[PDB]
Enzyme design. Structure first.
Site, PDB file in Angstrom:
ATOM      1  N   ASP A 218      -1.369   5.597  -5.365  1.00  0.00           N
ATOM      2  CA  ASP A 218      -1.830   4.704  -4.310  1.00  0.00           C
ATOM      3  C   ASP A 218      -2.160   3.284  -4.782  1.00  0.00           C
ATOM      4  O   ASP A 218      -3.267   3.008  -5.275  1.00  0.00           O
ATOM      5  CB  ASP A 218      -3.096   5.347  -3.729  1.00  0.00           C
ATOM      6  CG  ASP A 218      -3.661   4.659  -2.512  1.00  0.00           C
ATOM      7  OD1 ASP A 218      -3.071   3.648  -2.077  1.00  0.00           O
ATOM      8  OD2 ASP A 218      -4.713   5.141  -1.983  1.00  0.00           O
TER       9      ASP A 218
ATOM     10  N   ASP B 132       0.787  -1.218   0.000  1.00  0.00           N
ATOM     11  CA  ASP B 132       0.000   0.000   0.000  1.00  0.00           C
ATOM     12  C   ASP B 132       0.822   1.271   0.000  1.00  0.00           C
ATOM     13  O   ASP B 132       1.278   1.705   1.059  1.00  0.00           O
ATOM     14  CB  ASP B 132      -0.947  -0.008   1.206  1.00  0.00           C
ATOM     15  CG  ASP B 132      -1.860   1.199   1.211  1.00  0.00           C
ATOM     16  OD1 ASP B 132      -2.054   1.806   0.110  1.00  0.00           O
ATOM     17  OD2 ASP B 132      -2.465   1.476   2.280  1.00  0.00           O
TER      18      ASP B 132
END
Ligand SMILES: CC(=O)N[C@@H](Cc1cc(F)cc(F)c1)[C@H](O)[C@H]1C[C@@H](OCC2CCCCC2)CN1
Length: 393
Positions: free
Chosen positions: A236, A40
């Site tokens: 992201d 992440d």
């Protein structure tokens, strides 16, 4: 020259998909406990399931690690999708298909969660690769990558090649398939074609960048560039879609509808809720437009653009009747927290997170899905003026 791949041990170390996330194998504790961890770049906490959960087949057992250290402090992280609560500690951590190093890192042992774990995703934790500014409880909790760089000779950079299949994969197919590469400490030249173009990291919190122009099939969306970065734009891997600020989303979808107007789609499709299906092999990719995002360059008054295809922004899904049709969901959606360049956009590119030089590089991915007529692209330079004004304060 021919491009050599110098990071063979790390190539093909990821599994997963855009909808459920891409993960890497890690070990924690002594003796090592193997866990699959979501990669992440949109958060900064390393956290693992540490208690039974209906969606976890395994979890970290602190009592079985001789190297576990209790920090005697609770931690809570609220994401967009879900949230978790846990207990802080440290332990020795390694990445089997990574650098041959072991580091002592902060670990949040998840004891309670809501809408965090995903049934059948095959991951049991999350590796937040962004900066300490956004770490919970606060910026004193050193993120994993900072620990790795401080404790070893690993260069302060990592790169991601997320590989979308272009068709659906069930839990078993994810387990048996390669989902991409996370190269820790370098750039592997086999993972991309053409040149790498770099955009500055505006501020080290999220991986924040500045978008200066948006086009749909070469047509300028023509909004004031601050709208594209309201209130930020980030890279992201932990978000599936390309998410755009509400006003930009409304303009982009009006333009994408106009470009694809030879077919009418229901409102539920454009809202990213409903799938659309075509007879096997007949998806009309050519009626959908390409989308170009121009990013601030490292040279004063220069920008470059990244261009994605509908093969990136139409996410393959299984049919409700598991037929032979090819089905997809529209993977562009609105946001109230700024632009999010999620996994479906990262799937077009090899993305270099050059923390040492405070910049993010993009190149066309060697694994991007395309057709015989069009490919994703990274092109430049473009003379673009007053690009700093595109940033939101
Ligand atoms: C869809 C989404 O929430 N993705 C998560 C990861 C993720 C994946 C998943 F499968 C299930 C989750 F619950 C969460 C990403 O971090 C997103 C969330 C957002 O940052 C929030 C702040 C909040 C304050 C601390 C730092 C992060 C931008 N990046």
């Amino acid at each position: 020259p021919g491009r050599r791949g110098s990071f063979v041990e790390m190539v093909d170390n990821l599994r997963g998909k855009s909808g459920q996330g891409y993960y890497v194998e890690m070990t924690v504790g002594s003796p090592p406990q193997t866990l699959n961890i979501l990669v992440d770049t949109g958060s900064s906490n390393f956290a693992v399931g540490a208690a039974p959960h209906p969606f976890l087949h395994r979890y970290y057992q602190r009592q079985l690690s001789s190297t576990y250290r209790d920090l005697r402090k609770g931690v809570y992280v609220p994401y967009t999708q879900g949230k978790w609560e846990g207990e802080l500690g440290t332990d020795l951590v390694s990445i089997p298909h990574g650098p041959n190093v072991t580091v002592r890192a902060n670990i949040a042992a998840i004891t309670e969660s809501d809408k965090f774990f995903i049934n059948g995703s095959n991951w049991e934790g999350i590796l937040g690769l962004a900066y300490a500014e956004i770490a919970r409880p606060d910026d004193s909790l050193e993120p994993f990558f900072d620990s790795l760089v401080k404790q070893t000779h690993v260069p302060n950079l990592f790169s991601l090649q997320l590989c979308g299949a272009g068709f659906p994969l069930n839990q078993s197919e994810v387990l048996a398939s390669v989902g991409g590469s996370m190269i820790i400490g370098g750039i592997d030249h086999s993972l991309y074609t053409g040149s790498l173009w770099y955009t500055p990291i505006r501020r080290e919190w999220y991986y924040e960048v500045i978008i200066v122009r948006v086009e749909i099939n070469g047509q300028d969306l023509k909004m004031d560039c601050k709208e594209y970065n309201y209130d930020k734009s980030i890279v992201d891997s932990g978000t599936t879609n390309l998410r755009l600020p509400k006003k930009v989303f409304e303009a982009a979808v009006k333009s994408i509808k106009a470009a694809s107007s030879t077919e009418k789609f229901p409102d539920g499709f454009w809202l990213g809720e409903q799938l659309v299906c075509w007879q096997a092999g007949t998806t009309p990719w050519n009626i959908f437009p390409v989308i170009s995002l121009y990013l601030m360059g490292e040279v004063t008054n220069q920008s470059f653009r990244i261009t994605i295809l509908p093969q990136q922004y139409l996410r393959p899904v299984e049919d409700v009747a598991t037929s032979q049709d090819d089905c997809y969901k529209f993977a562009i959606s609105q946001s109230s927290t700024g632009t999010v360049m999620g996994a479906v956009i990262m799937e077009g590119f090899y993305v270099v997170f050059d923390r040492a030089r405070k910049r993010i590089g993009f190149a066309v991915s060697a694994c991007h899905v395309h057709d015989e007529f069009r490919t994703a692209a990274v092109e430049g330079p473009f003379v673009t003026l007053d690009m700093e004004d595109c940033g939101y304060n």
